[model samples]
Target chain A: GSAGNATEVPANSTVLSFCAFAVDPAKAYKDYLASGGQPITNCVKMLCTHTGTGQAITVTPEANMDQESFGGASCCLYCRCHIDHPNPKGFCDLKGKYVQIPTTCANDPVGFTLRNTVCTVCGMWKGYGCSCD
Target chain B: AENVTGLFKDCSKIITGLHPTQAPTHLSVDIKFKTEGLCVDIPGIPKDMTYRRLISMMGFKMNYQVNGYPNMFITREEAIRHVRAWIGFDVEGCHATRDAVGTNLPLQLGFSTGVNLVAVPTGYVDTENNTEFTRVNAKPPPGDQFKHLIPLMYKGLPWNVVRIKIVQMLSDTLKGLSDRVVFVLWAHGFELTSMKYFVKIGPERTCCLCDKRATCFSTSSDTYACWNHSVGFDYVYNPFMIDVQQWGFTGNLQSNHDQHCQVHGNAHVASCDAIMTRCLAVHECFVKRVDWSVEYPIIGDELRVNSACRKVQHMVVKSALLADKFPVLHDIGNPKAIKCVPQAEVEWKFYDAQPCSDKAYKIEELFYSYATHHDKFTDGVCLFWNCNVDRYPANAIVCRFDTRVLSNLNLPGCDGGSLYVNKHAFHTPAFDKSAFTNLKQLPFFYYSDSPCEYVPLKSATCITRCNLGGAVCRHHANEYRQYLDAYNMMISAGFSLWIYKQFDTYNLWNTFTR
Candidate 1:
């Protein structure tokens, strides 16, 4: 989830929303997932799968994530400064399973606009997004 | 260790540690005055007088003394030199060694490359003469350092008396601003274990006496006697008693030591030996003689001597209470007409671990009880509380207790579940001759406005007078928001988030207007 990955980002840098990941050929990827296709852990993993020689990626669900708990879903959302990446990245679920899809990721979601999309200036998942006043 | 001689290498440490071995001698300086109800208020003064002028009007004359050195109090430089000499060659040698050591090692370390290290009970000593140790045996430093090494010395008066006098004078002078003042009386040293058990902690503890009922034949007898005598004085003490009387506690003033008196039992005058032998049995009777009545502004709880009798003593109608107590200020407006009223009780606990836990310890058993009798109101004071390490959980609990108490009281200065930020905003460079100018006689360091800058009476006038035509003092009043903005930013993101919200709304409004 965006919350889980946010904690890994450094103070001055930005990170991808763990709860959102989208690969190119977006139409096909969306349809495949909508029609019951298996979601890949991340965009990179899906790329590796399409290439056919990479490690198999599986997306898993978080059965018991709570919003208010420290280091829980909310912490993952607000405390993502610990994350280091700009684009949505793969993260293991609480059960150690891979997440194939962004929407099914553990923890609370990030903002609406940037979900399922890669970085272009690492704009924020919310607020004025990338830059501060 | 033979080469090691006098203790300490630097005079600064000696001067820092220097204190009078005995209370100041009178030296024939006489203070004459009245004792009518010990009036604290000066009625004739104009209400709007400048605090500066009022302090001058209420000024007290006092002489200073350095132990064993006469005329030392005449000047700062003389006081510094005489006190250094009083410590003698032992400290002199230490100072020489400190200078010889140059800048390599700090003076407090006691071991310099050129200095000989001799062992005195405390840290170190020089051995060139070893005269001080040989003559006096170098008594280990006094346990009660604060009492001995009072930062300032007054002639003809002990530190304790001086403290009371200062508090009373200020309480009277700045009655309107009394709420900003707090009296922190820090009592140190332990009482005799036997006395503690019999009088305070009870029979389980034993020291001078083998059993609780046995006669304490040693100096403990004198100590116990002193304690009882000290406690008795509180009942008849003049300053507060007259005020207490005014407060309607119509108890008769009688001899605190009349053993055969009918009003108070013989316990007040119990013999030293009698108290020692039967203190456990007679403890209740002794406790009963003490009048526990408390009326704010006039009287308070009798100063508890605790178990050991290691406490303060004495009071009388002695020393003239000044006749011309009232002073008026002409230029400034009337001073804030304030009365002495006991405000909230503050308890500041500095402990090693959780309070009351075995791992924790209080620096002194008789923790400071700051008296608020003169404070004008319960506002603008601040206290911050938080535990260390991973005690965020513990911090939460402690603050819960703090908030519960603070919320119940009308203390405007404190905040429940929030950090306290009692920020004062006014500035004036110390050396600057005029506003925003570098002109100065000395400018090595900076200075700011005094507490008088914000005196409510003067502050109101200063805003109009000093702050006129874009002045700094006026800037404080003219600001959109004052006092808390800078402080708020330092503590939390609360202010930043608010600023963010403001910007976001402004942008929305700008777009709508367009």
Candidate 2:
């Protein structure tokens, strides 16, 4: 079913399936829909975050939203560093929507701290950037 | 005991057997942003950011390092076993089947635990004075030397929100003494990154016998070791620390990389990749500072040198081990557990040996699963190090067990070899001639690219007879061939998913094609 008046598919759809490798899609798609845009074909965004914890949740998003899992903070696979999309900042500006967080090895007792967060590469000139915008 | 002690500049001293009466106030200095222009003129760091902001900035940078290696333990057989159970239950969605299964995944049940030794307890001070020469109190607190912090620290946001950007890297190169068999599994197929679990078994409580004259010291196996050279209590705490650290670096926005977050004049946070790289570098820097030392001295320059040396040595080893455990390039499943069925015509040979049972002397519980049948054949569970070890036996099983199995596997209990390699003492029953002699005579387990085998054996009744003196058992050679074929097919198929990237990088990307 189309939203209100829109029907069937766009004349030439460029839709892409979403890959939640380190990406998020719920936000991307939600934004796409809000902007009166359409994924002409099977669209996919890489590297996503978990729902809230900011932990990197490795999952994929497909046209069928039901087959998706959330990971990391606000970011998803498409916005994350992936295949064709290389520059994270120059291209996609993940405001409060996406951030890189880390996962914990449940077995060990000594948990992480600011000094130990696996995803703490939050600097611009280096590898990762600030998790918080 | 030389009680004459003062402090030094920019250095601290800790005595081996001295529990300080008071929490020594550390006079560490911090530069703050004075409202006046007394110290103004910095190029990169903004005055508006303030010194506190700079400190917070350092704190933020440190957070990435610590968070990067959060709750990470070294790679060992015990560590991998924990990984399987953790992944199976948490991510893969496997739950506890029964009480028998409970023993395998006891941590999931949340047992009270052996001892709380995560970080050094606050009661244990760094050094009595600010001198290099310090002593390790013989009878320190029952808690670990480093156990003040809570589990929430790994969450990136600790209880103290101000310290969100702090990290304590793993810097020790401590190695877990595991069976070689387990190592083989890793070499074969187990994914190094998949390995998880942080195990710490410290020397049981070592109490001081204060009644007698503390003449000398002898090393106690379980608890603390005392030194007779000194007149005070000196307890040794050597906890076997084991755990895994798994993570990868990709790009993202809101990452300190966005221009919005960057310093006004600096283009530092311009790209996502750059920020990720910086995070990784800081991670390495912090983890490189973690260290582990088995022994410590009481006093003098010897003590200082030993402490400094140990600190540096331990930190480097930890960092290297962490890095080496999960190299940038690896086949997705580098160290994997492999298991396969035997041939229908081949008889699976199993040995059952109990600690008390002599078959003529005495007996207790079954070495394998006593609750189940087949007690005569099953002695103990043989956990394959990787895929190859599993294929050695026909009814090979890969179950999720708890970390306790590791201590039992070490030596005192079952003296079985690692799944990947042989772990045996000549005097032990594992080397008995009746078991493994002349292996070439039997159809050997074949190694390939898969994790299972298709043996032709329908039942054990049809097994070919073997000479009583030899370990050789007869079976269709095709069983080995079948298993090999399956492994190759599965591995190649999985690898082919990204054939184009296969040639780009071999070791790092082999586990995961591009």
By summed lDDT, the worst window of 10 consecutive residues in model 2 chain B runs over B53-62
lDDT, candidate 1, A12-70, per-residue tens: 11012111111112232234345443332111111111211111111211121211101
Q: List ranges where model 2 is wrong by over 4 Å.
A: A1-133, B1-36, B39-113, B118-514
Clashes of each: 48, 171
Q: What share of the true interface contacts does candidate 1 keep?
A: 0.00
Candidate 1 residue lDDT tens string, B108-191 = 101001121122111111111110111111121224532332221111222223223332333333232211211110010111
Lowest lDDT 10-residue stretch of candidate 2 chain A: A1-10
Best by lDDT: 2
Q: What is the Å distance of residue B348 in model 1 from its true position?
A: 39
Q: For model 2, state the Cα shift of residue B477 in Å.
A: 31
Off by over 4 Å in 1: A1-133, B1-165, B168-498, B501-506, B510-514
In TM-score terms, candidate 2 sits at 0.16
